Structures are given as C-alpha cells and as structure tokens.
Amino acid sequence: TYLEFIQQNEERDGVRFSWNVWPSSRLEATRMVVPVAALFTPLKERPDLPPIQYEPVLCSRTTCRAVLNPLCQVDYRAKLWACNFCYQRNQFPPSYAGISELNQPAELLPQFSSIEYVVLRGPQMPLIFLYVVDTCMEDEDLQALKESMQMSLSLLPPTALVGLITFGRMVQVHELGCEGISKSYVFRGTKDLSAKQLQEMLGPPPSNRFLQPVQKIDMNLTDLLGELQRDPWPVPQGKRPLRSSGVALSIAVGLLECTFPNTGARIMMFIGGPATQGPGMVVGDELKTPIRSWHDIDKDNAKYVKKGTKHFEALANRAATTGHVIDIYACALDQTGLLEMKCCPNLTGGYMVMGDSFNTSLFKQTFQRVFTKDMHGQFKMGFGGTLEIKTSREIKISGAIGPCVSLNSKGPCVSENEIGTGGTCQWKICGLSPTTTLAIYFEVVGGRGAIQFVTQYQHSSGQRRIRVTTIARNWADAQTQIQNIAASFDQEAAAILMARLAIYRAETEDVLRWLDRQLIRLCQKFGEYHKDDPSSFRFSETFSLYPQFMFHLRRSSFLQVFNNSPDESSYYRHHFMRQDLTQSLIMIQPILYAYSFSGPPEPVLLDSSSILADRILLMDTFFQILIYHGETIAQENFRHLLQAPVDDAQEILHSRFPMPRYIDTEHGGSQARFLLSKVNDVSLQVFMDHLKKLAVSSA
Amino acid sequence: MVLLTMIARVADGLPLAASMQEDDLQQYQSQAKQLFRKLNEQSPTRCTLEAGAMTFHYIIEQGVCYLVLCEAAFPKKLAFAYLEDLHSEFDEQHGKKVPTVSRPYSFIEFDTFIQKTKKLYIDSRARIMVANIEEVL
Amino acid sequence: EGLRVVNLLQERNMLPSTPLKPPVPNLHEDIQKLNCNPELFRCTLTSIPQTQALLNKAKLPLGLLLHPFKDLVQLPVVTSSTIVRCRSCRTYINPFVSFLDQRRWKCNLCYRVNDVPEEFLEPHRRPEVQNATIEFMAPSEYMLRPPQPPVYLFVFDVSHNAVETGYLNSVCQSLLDNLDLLPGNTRTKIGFITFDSTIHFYGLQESLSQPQMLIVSDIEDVFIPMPENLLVNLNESKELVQDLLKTLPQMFTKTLETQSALGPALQAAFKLMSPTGGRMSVFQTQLPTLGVGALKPREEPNHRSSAKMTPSTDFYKKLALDCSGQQVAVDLFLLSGQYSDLASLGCISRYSAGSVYYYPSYHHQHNPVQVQKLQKELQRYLTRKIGFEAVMRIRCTKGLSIHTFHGNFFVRSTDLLSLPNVNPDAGYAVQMSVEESLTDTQLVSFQSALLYTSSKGERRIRVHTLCLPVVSTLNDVFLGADVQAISGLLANMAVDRSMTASLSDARDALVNAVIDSLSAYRSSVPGLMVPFSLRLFPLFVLALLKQKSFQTGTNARLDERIFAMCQVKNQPLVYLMLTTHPSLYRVDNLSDEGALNISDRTIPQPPILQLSVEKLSRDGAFLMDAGSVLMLWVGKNCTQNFLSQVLGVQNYASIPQPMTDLPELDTPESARIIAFISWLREQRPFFPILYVIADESPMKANFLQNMIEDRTESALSYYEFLLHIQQQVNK
Ligand SMILES: O=C(O)CCCc1ccccc1
Ligand SMILES: [Zn+2]
Ligand SMILES: [Zn+2]
C-alpha cells in the first residue's frame, strides 16, 4: 500500500516526497508539473533508536565522503564496502575488524536508515541564554514577564551561561553577581555598535563577567529579575515610550559575537511594543500616527519599514553567521514590528511568539513549553546545526525553504536553477527542534536514486551529534514512466511543498497566477477527461484532494494578507515555513468536528452546510481552537455534549508549541466570524467548475 | 507638557515658592513676574493665557496665585488639577503665614512637594478664561 | 611710633618679637573707628597717592586684598524693605557717605547727591551707616531664578593607583561623620561618581535592595543614564547614601584599571549638575591619560636645571568656564605620587571659583602626615559655610580704576566676578591705578559686595566698605605703606608674570620692586636707608624668593610649585604671610609672660624669632608655625626635662620617627606647651596638624627650608641680599 509506504517512511526517516518514483529520463524530468521535493524533519522523534557512540564511517573519496548506510554493498569476507554514491570501495576501520555477516553494524540494517551518532572528542561547551528585556510596558505585563523569566531560570542546566540585557530609552548590559552593588553598562539606544566596538567598551569552563554559569549566579539573577522596574523615563502626553529595540538586539548580537562565537546560544528578546527610536525604528513616538498596516505599505505610507527591515536583516545574518539563535516574544495590544524583525527568528531557528499581554495563560504557558524536556531531563532543542545533502550523480539540489542559511558550498550536487535559499549543498540551522521541517527541492539532470541527509548539531547535553538519514526511491520504468510516477504522488506533501513556493515568492515579491497554471497543468497531465467536456473530468484517488488543498491555500491568510495586520501575516507565515506535513495541512485546511446527541464526535466538511443549529463544532486552525454552539444549543446528557469538545480541546491545547488561542462562541456571537471565514474565485463548487472548464480545454 | 511653577502673593507679586529644571527659562520667567504684578483683587480667579507654543494656567486662592507654564499641547484639564493639589497643600501648610512674610521665597522648602506632585502629572503612565498673554501684559 | 629712618645693615634684628599688626590709616578718629576690619579688607598703601605720577615715583604697587566671606564673630543683618543705593553707581549706603540736608546724602564713590527715602528714618543712626561690614536681604530683583538648593557632587578616581593610595576609605569616613553637618536645609541634594577608564554613576532608590552602578563606557559621548535618582535628597535618602559610603571603598580592591579618563568624567559630572549648580568635589590621584583632556608626561626638574608653568591644554579652562556659566564650582583634590600636570588641572578650579587641595604622595599606610592633613582639611571643607550662585563687584571712588583681578573666579564683564561658589577660606586681590588725579577729594572709598544664595535658600548681600585718605607727598606714601599687603600683591603679580613671561622675570620683578622703591626713597632723602614701614620689605621679598612658588636651585617638583602658586592666588593675606615667613618660637622653656587672662588658662607668649639656624639651639626645642602645619623641631642635646615631661620619652633616641602629635601628660611643662599650641590653632579655622617628626634624622625636617635668612648652595642669605640691594640702590 502506497499509503502505508508514505506513513512508515515519514515515521522512520522524517521525510515526505512529492513523488516517490522519479523521472528516469530527461524527457520526463523537465516535464514535471510539481518538482521532486521533500519535507525533511532532521530531528524527528521515534521509538527509542540506539545512539551510536562510535564515529560514523565515511567514504574514502575527497569529494564524496558519504556515510556508511544500508544501500552500501558490503563484502564481509574481504572487509570491504562499496560506496553507493561514488562506487568507491573502502576498507573497514580497525574497530570494525571483528565484523561479520552474522553480526553487523547498525548503520547497515535497513532499520537504521536514519541513525544518530555521538562524537566525543572536544570538551563540551555550556549552553548560553541571553535575556533581552523591554521595560516600556505596564506594570502588570512587566511583573508577569519577570515571573516567566524567573521560572525559566529554574529550568536551565547548571552549566549554562546566562546574561541579562534590559532596555527602554537606554540599553543596560548587566554584569551579574557583583557583591553589594549591582552594576550594568548603559548605552544610548540612539546609535548602533559593532561587535569590536562593544568589546572594547566592555573589556576549566569559560564564562564572562556578563555570562555566568547558572549554578553560581542563579540566586543573584532571580533577585535582579525580581527588582526590574519599568523604564524610568517619563512618557509625555500623547507620546509612545522611547523604546530602543533595534540597538538592544544589536548589542545582544555583538556581545555574544565577541564572547562565544560559533556555539549554541539563545538570544531571547521580550518585546512589549514597537521600536520607536534608533536603527530599526518601526513607528514614531507620536500616538497621533498609527502603526503601519498592509493598506499603508501598499500606498507607500510607511516610511520606517524598509529601513527598519534592513537593520534587523543585517542582525539576522550576523547572528546566523556566528551560529546564534534569536527568539522574539512580543505581547502588546498595538503592533510590535514583527514584519521588520521577522528575519531574525526566520533565518536562525528562533521562535516567534505573539500575544496581547505577558499577563495571560497564553504567553505564560507558551513560554514554558520552550523548556519542555524529554525522557532524560534535557531540552528538546539543538544548536548550530549543519545540514549537508549527498545526492546520486543524477540528482541536483535546487534549494531549500525553511529556517536555514546557506553555507555557500559549491559541488556537483548544486543545481543551476536555485529555489529559496539555494546554490549550496550545505545549510546552517542555528536552532532546531524535533519539529523543524525544511523543504528541499531537487532536480533530475535497475532503479533507485539516493539522497543522504547529514545533520551535525550541538545537543542540549553539550554532546556533538550527527544525524544521518539515507533514503532510496525507485527510478521510473521506461515502459511505464508516467504511470508509475502518477501512482507515487503524495498530494498532501506536494500541496505543502507548492504552498512553500507560493508563500516564499509572496514574502519576497501575481503569485496566484503561478499557483493556478500549475493546478491546471497537473489536471491535464494526470487527470481523466474528454477534450472540451468539463463533466468528463475525474481525478485518481491519488490526486483528488489536491484541488481542494489548492482552493483553501489560495484563500488562506498566507496569501490574502489584507484583513490581517502585517505582524500577524509574518507570524502566520513564520510557523507554516517550519511545521511538518500534518500541522501544515491543519493551517491551510482547518479540521472540523461536529458534536450532537445523534452520534459521537465526527469530522465534517469545511462548508456552510456543516453549521447546524443543534450541533456543537470544534474547529482546529493550527493557530486557534474554536468551539461553536448552534442557535439551539446556545442555551447529565446535555453536559456530556457541552463539554465533549472542551475535553478534546484540552488535549491538543497542550501538545502544540505555540499554544493556540481558545475561543468559546455561538450563533450571533461576534467571535463566530472566525468559523464563518474559514468555512465554505468564490466557493469550492464554482472553483471546481471553472477549473474543469480549463483542464478539458487548451493546454 | 513640561514645566515652570510659581506661587506668589497677589498683592505685591512677592514670590513664595517655585520650581524650574532645564537640562529659555529667562523670557517666560519675566512674563510670569509681569503677570504677578498686574494681578489684583479684580482679576479673574481662574484663567488661561496663550503665548504661542506655550500656555500659562493659574488660579488664585486667599490672595495667593498658583501659576504654571507648559507647552500648549499639555491638557488644560490636567494643568488646573495640578494647581489645586498645590493650593490645598500650600494653604493647609502655609496659608496663615502668607500675609506676614516679606522675604522673597520664604517657602523655598515647598520645592519638595511641588516636584513630587509635578511628576504625578508629567507621565501619561501615572495618569476659567482664555486670553492671549500679550494682551494682559 | 615710627617716622624714623632705618639702616637695614646696622639693625639686622628688625623683626619684632610680637605679631605684626596692620597699619592704621591716617584718618580722623571718628572716621577710622568705623573703618572696615583689616582682616576683611586692606590696601597696600593706606595713604592713596593723589596722582599716578606720585604712585609711579614710589615704585610700590597699589591694590586691595580682601577676604570677604570670612567667618565673623558678629554680623549685622539689615532686612530693609528697601536697599538704599546711589542712583548713579549703585554703591550701597555706607558709613563714609556725606549727609548734608539729612534728607540728602552725597555718594562717597561718585559724589552724586541722593534722596534719603521715608523708610530710612536721625538717618545717620541707621545700621547701614554705622557698620562698614553688613549683610542685606536681597529683594526679588537680585536673583535670576529661585534660590538654588545645596547640591554636592563627589567625583572619585578609582583607578589602580588611586585604590593603592587608600584615600577613598577616609574620604568616605569623613562624609559619613559629617553628613548631618553639610550646609543645607531639607532641599539638600547629593550625588556620587567614580571613574577610571569608564564613568560610573550611582542611582539610589528606596525601592531597590542596593544602589545601582550605571557605567557609561562611551568616553567620547558622555550622557546621563537616569533622570531621577542620581542626585538624591539627602534628608529623604540619608540611609541610602550611608550604605554607599560604607560600600564604596570595598568595590575596587582588586582593580587593574591603570588609566583615568578624568576629562570625560568631569564632562559627565558637569551634565549631571548643569540643571541646578552647586559644589563638585573631584578626587584625582594621577596623570589623566584616557580620552579628551589627556595630558602628556613630563620629566621633573632637578637642582641643576635653570629657569626655563603654563597649562599644556585649555580643555580644563574651557570646561571651567562652562561650569561657571551654570553655577558649578569644582574643587580639585590631587593626591598624586607622580607628576600629574596640575598646571593644566588647576584651570578647573581657578576659573570656576573652586580651590585645589594637594596631598603629595598620599598613602594610607606610608604617609601618616598626609592622612591626618586630609582628614582635618576635609573636616573644614565639609563643615564650613558656603554660598551658591554668587557674584562680587569691587567698587572704588571715581579716579581710581581696577585693572587686574587675582583669585579663583571668572571676570564676567567690565568688573563683574562670577563666583559659582563662595567659601569663607578664599582670598582675593586687586591692582588699581589713578586714572584721574584725586585733586578734588581728600578721602577715597572702596566697596565690595557679595550677592549669594545661602545654604538655607536666601539671597543675601554682604557689603564691606573701606575708607582711606589721599596724600600728595612721596614721604606720606611711604609712611602709610603696608609691608605685608605689598608682599601679598607682589606674590600675585609674580605668579602672573611666571605664566606670562618666565620664572626668571617673575623673580627679577620681585627683586626690582625692592630696589626701585628704596632707590626712589634714597633719591628723596651711606648704608641701606629705608623708612620704618619698609624695614621688613627686603626680608619678606627674600622669603618670597625662597618659597616653593619662586625658588630656583631647589630640588622642587612641578606640581609642588604650581600648588604653591595656587595658594598664593587663593589664600588670604595672613596665611600667605604665615606660609612665606613662618613664626618661629622656642618652646622648651615657656613661662608666665603670656596671656594668662583667659580665665583658667595661662598662655605663654614666647617671642617670635627670626628665620635663621643661628637662632636655633641643640640644647632646646623650637616650634615653627607655618600656618597650615606646626613643625616642632627638637635639638640633639635637648634637655631631659623636655623629653620625659613634654615628649614622654626617656632619651633623644627613642622619640618615635613620625610623631603625629604631642602627648597630653600630667606635667606643667606639658600643660604649658599644649596651652600655647591650642591657642595657636584657635587663631584659625583650618586645624593645623603638628608633627614633631622634624628631628635631626627624620629626613623630613624641611623645617630648615624655612630658615630664609641663611644662605644655601643656590640662594643668597639675608645679609647677602641686603648687600646686593644697596649695590643696586646707589649704582
Ligand atoms: O549689577 C549689580 O551690581 C547688582 C547685581 C550684582 C551685585 C549684587 C549685590 C552686590 C553687588 C553686585
Ligand atoms: Zn563515496
Ligand atoms: Zn554713587
């Protein structure tokens, strides 16, 4: 079963391809409607694979140097193995001398196609956590933020180094634990500083005066964090506070850049409002002028966006080059400037959290899920990840879309046609989790084409680790080319991979026109129809859902940016460009369950026809969980029904990292608008009718 | 939305208490003293004066004038609430000694309450007559 | 008792045994009895020359020396609803006006007749006319702004060298001991800054567990890091500043900061105080080398180098002028062990009406003399009275014109003196000329008036008025000469000549002032003949030429000489004389000829000896009163009764090497010497430490450097000096 195949391979190898059978010719490679691409999750969790505490064996060919994998032809008699990528034959290392066909190494069993190695050589670096705290916010928000940071302090490893930077009009770099005095270095939030400048002005396991081990400093930091008060500078009437977000971040970047370059560090910036001063300014300090909107940016009435975006884009590249993660936790009633600051968490592996106030269950719970540990008491985060991809000589890499940065590494696996962050065989991901999902786009230039994913990263323990996933997919049979290709089509994966392309072009500018020309083309090549007969059009069970996924994608808030604020659009797209397949489908097409006396809970269509008066609905947008009560139900048996969705809500309202916003509404309620807009050119029926008219007519 | 505060005896314009911080003060301090000279027993007890980008606000209670200057954008609703807080405190603490002093600024130490009260109005966080001043002068 | 001529070569013992007293102007009995106190106001020539030609003939400088804010026993305070001032020259109604109609009074400085107001009523009995010294309550128009509060900002060097000196510990202890004694009312504010390579502010809030050290590292672009709690109310936040003064000495014990950015720190301290003004106390221990205002190192001279002074930059002068315009005075405490370019650093205090205090080679363990000296000077500095935001005008009768000002201030316009602070230990001097011949008048007057804000927030005017007669005879100009005041004015003139020209010229003009005046006297009368009033003129000028300000062949170092010139420009006349020509007494045989008047105390009054080793005696002990210190020199063959009953020792060899003070033993010899010493230090408000260390072997017995009559290897004796003058007088 091709579905069993797709399920098991994602469960084992954390990957999902648009096509699992690839064009064995040049005449079908160019004529691919949806590119050969893979939704790759480099750190996916699974049923307790054995960690391999020996160095991974590597092919002895300068260019190739692939890792020993189950596709490698071995000869237990001659103690030799032949690399499946370059056909080079290799001698076994001395520790493999006692090898035998009966008892053979893990990396050769097909079960360990995805395997993790541990390299123990160098002394492990401690983790680094740099808190960057806005002080321009109401007392109830600041007090709540203070408690959240004090809580996270109690979860960090005793080895980790911590630093604290607070800011408002000025920037304060706190020197922790200094006896009876408490000091900090104060800087103007008015001019930027470079790392070399910052180093001159400022100055067994390593640590600075500004970055100290948790175990020696936690007591002084929790007292400092407890005494943090709001920015002392008064806010005059009709003014916003002077908030130097852009310079505080460039001081946090520059601080780590000159103290611990090239090692896992987390710059966690907590924002209570927009940058109103200095490089990176988002809006002026006059309350009379509102923060920019999408309408303002289209009519060229946003004089800060481009200059402010450019400032944070250079900070993102500085931090991503140095190997450091930038988080942004933003909570305020107005906008914050996420549109200008998006590249910092986007280019690194940094989180982006968005709420109304730090004094909410939403933020407090979302913030502590950052520090969720696994079955060993270790954070589910990695640092300084390096992704390298070995392909068969027939495969070339166009590029990647997701949280990563190119290492600009040239090799025969690099394609001319680049996509997203392309032109490279290697990418750096400064922060990753078991969820981080990249999209790799490939190009074809017995059977089986092979690809190997090698991910070196720093574990939360400090151990250096190498994840190796080697996959194989059959080459098309020449006498059955498109028929095998059509059967190996993953409509969900290709929908998300095509959505990745559409959003990447939108966020870096029509895009709907490209999306339709590929839907129509896919209908003609793989659909069944008589020419000029729209009613004759059918789709295989392999393709039938693809048009509907395209209907919801082209109307989603990822491409219809208006009716949302720019910070919300950048937040939505931030999380879609990171999630696995299953969660991505939820974002584009929210799941809908119905609850009534007449039967247990059942999923229903995202159509106005599913909104009944005597039925309770549960809509799972990935970003919000909504419970709707029909006009009748709005008023022991009536209790089971009223709390059946609430019970199912709580379960998923905890696994999801960005805790979704919860909504209890009903017919006539104002908040019912969120259900009425995801539900229902115009409707899908009309959309389908217009699509069939063009599929059966000219190509 | 900034400040200059002066409390003076209406009869002779004798300064009683004031408070000023810069980091000009010279021109508007003169106008303030011009006004203290003109004010008498027929003057409006509550008034507001327009001086371009600046605006004077005062009240008069028990022969004592409470004057404040600020940028015209400062809420006139707030300027008078700040003068009432000063007056009730000043009249409670020094109201009975005012008609006997003869030294200028015989209540310099009222400086302290002025500024602690002043900060409770020049920070949105904490939260009659009109005539061009050039006329009265 | 002296209209006689004196042959300086035959006397050679002309210095009297009892203290010198200032001359009495040749004035009518009733006029002189109201004249100003000569301690507060005095003139080089008590008989003013009628013409500039007569003044030029005498070859003596005409000028005034004043100590206007001196602590007084009794001060009349007029609270007049109206200040009576002459309608023309704004002179305050003074005892030396001319009441005629009695409703009209003739101004003694510009001769205009003024109408006495129906507020001043017998108008001549009014206290404004019975007191040459008086304080007025300034009206509302004598102030540019509300009276400023007392603001004290202390700026400490905390570099590696500074921490090694250990000065911070005692300064913080003095502040803790004298916190309630700082002048001011409930409006008093106080702040603190430390600095090394960066500038350290200290916020103090009652809401926080401990003070907060805010460090601005942008040395080229200093700013204020916090708006409220850097300058704090001392009354409200007394507890918070006490914890800081106990914690401050402990914060920098292990410091490796070798450089000091004094310039930017002073710019930081200026910005902090600019809004209000006040007193900035700066404590610096080494050469500033980092940032703006840096000064280059210099190699100290030796006994061999000739007379080949001025600042090396104008940064500190410019910064002082900016402080002056904002009512900020800067007092510099230099406790340096090496050259620090005080000739440039001093500009911060000269042009801001501050005062520099120098403690050469201060060390908490190594230099106990400088430790106790700083403690006693800090006691006086922190508890003496103070006036803020002040100005002083010096008026004199028409025909006399002031052309040069001496002291720590900024001369604002024609004649106006800016005094960001005024302190009771400051002295000023002025030089004048006869711009218009005084044929009309027979008296001329001088009025100084000090407008200032008191520590309690009250504008006050202190006015002193001096009246002198006019003469037209050379001999009459000599009969009224004040030898000490002429010495004081010549010292200030010689300091200016050093900066302006060289030390050689300054030394020459000093010698020429004696030759030219006595040559003029001789040309209007064999030996060296001088009038009685000038019999100490060559003696005091020689003492000037051997003082550390102007000495040549000595091993003196640069900052020592500059600090000696700073004391010339800023000390009152009495302490300039006590420093230049210290009073020497023999104290091992005191007895009853004293002032035993004081109820239960008998104070011995030993005779003043002349400054020569020929007057010493190995058989006795000699105390030298140099004004700021009291060095007690003990002879080798000193008597045994003195050792055991006064020093508390059994022999000369067991007299402790540094002896910080005498014991108070139960002997009448000890009671006598403690009575004489305590009587000496009661004559001044600046407690002078007494170290008997001067001993034969102490090697700190510079005590001999003050024997200005003996010859040294690189200077003339007093008799050699008289011989050189006579050769020049009748050349
Ligand atoms: O211009 C003036 O002289 C009056 C202001 C300065 C001053 C005040 C008091 C005394 C002397 C001088
Ligand atoms: Zn190989
Ligand atoms: Zn006059």
Author numbering:
A (entry chain A): 3 to 205, 223 to 464, 474 to 537, 541 to 666, 679 to 723, 746 to 764
B (entry chain C): 1 to 23, 29 to 132, 148 to 157
C (entry chain B): 346 to 466, 476 to 662, 666 to 882, 888 to 1093
Give sentences from the paper.
The packaging of cargo transmembrane proteins into COPII-coated vesicles entails a direct interaction between COPII protein and cytoplasmically-oriented ER export signals. About a half dozen export signals have been identified to date, almost all comprising short peptide motifs, all of them binding to the Sec24 subunit of the COPII inner coat. The ΦC export signal was identified in studies of p24-family and ERGIC-53 proteins, and comprises a C-terminal signature of a pair of hydrophobic residues or a single terminal valine residue. The ΦC motif contacts a site on Sec24a that is also the binding site for the LxxLE- and DxE-class export motifs.
Notably, 4-PBA has a structural formula that resembles the cytoplasmic ER export signal of p24 proteins—one or two C-terminal hydrophobic residues, termed the ΦC motif. As an initial test of the hypothesis that 4-PBA targets the COPII coat, crystals of Sec23a/Sec24a•Sec22b were equilibrated with solutions containing 4-PBA at concentrations of 1, 15 and 50 mM. Difference Fourier maps calculated from X-ray diffraction data show clear evidence for binding of 4-PBA to the B site of Sec24a. (F–I) Residual (Fo-Fc) electron density (2.8 Å resolution, 2.3 σ contour, no phase bias) at the B site for crystals soaked in 4-PBA at the indicated concentrations. In summary, the crystallographic result gives evidence that 4-PBA binds the COPII coat at relevant concentrations of the small molecule.
